[PDB]
Amino acid sequence: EFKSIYSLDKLYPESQGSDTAWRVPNGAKQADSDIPLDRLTISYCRSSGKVNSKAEVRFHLATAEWIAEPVRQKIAITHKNKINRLGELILTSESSRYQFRNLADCLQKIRDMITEASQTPKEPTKEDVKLHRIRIENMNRERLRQKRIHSA
Amino acid sequence: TSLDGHLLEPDAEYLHWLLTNIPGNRVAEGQVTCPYLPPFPARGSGIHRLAFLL
Amino acid sequence: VTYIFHQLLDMREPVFEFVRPPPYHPKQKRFPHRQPLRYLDRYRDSHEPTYGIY
């Protein structure tokens, strides 16, 4: 009823509607990178009290329709250690004690994995702390080869 | 046999390949008693080992 | 190993991780004489501002 000079309508003449701050922009924000929540199975199976909550989310990666074929194949090849036996991508986090923060962290992890799996021209940072010994062992195993014919 | 690979009993071990009654060099004429099975080391486990007992 | 455990043993692949024992810390006294400010963070559970009755 009361309104002064510093009112919400006078300072912004373009925004004077009664529902301009509650209109959900669903029709202009429905891209493929939204991650549908109806096909995700989020469950909480930990209640520690070292107070940290666990938020495990899994979904069938082979039946995901919101993901293209090449990016799906790339993210399945480069992350073949987190795939369950039934084709379930199990991703969990253990940082905060709240379930909302863990869910947001899992969503951010999924988003960065998706945005890095599609980008194939990615410069890999050459590390020398844990892969050097692996490369040395692989080279030494490949060096000891000097036969002529073997099948099987 | 694999000295490292048994998940249940720590002191025991698993069996992979086993032969018997090998006519000298003929390693293809003797009877079979245990089908060959490739090693299956765990992920977080260390470095397993398999010895050939002849 | 995944394919072996899948189409050779009819089970799931077990995973492990080389864990380490927790670090040693003396008994937290009431008045830590001559100790840095980070002495309370050594025995702190979570690094988040907790609130009780508020």
Binding site: - | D4, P10, A42, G46, I47, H48 | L9, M11
Partner: peptide, 24 residues
């Protein structure tokens, strides 16, 4: 249940050439 799932939570290794191969 599968009887072959006897994994146990603790797994030991009886190989002396193991700790130095993992840089631990």
């Amino acid at each position: 249940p599968v009887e072959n799932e006897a994994v146990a939570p603790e797994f030991t290794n009886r190989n002396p050439r193991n700790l130095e191969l993992l840089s631990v």
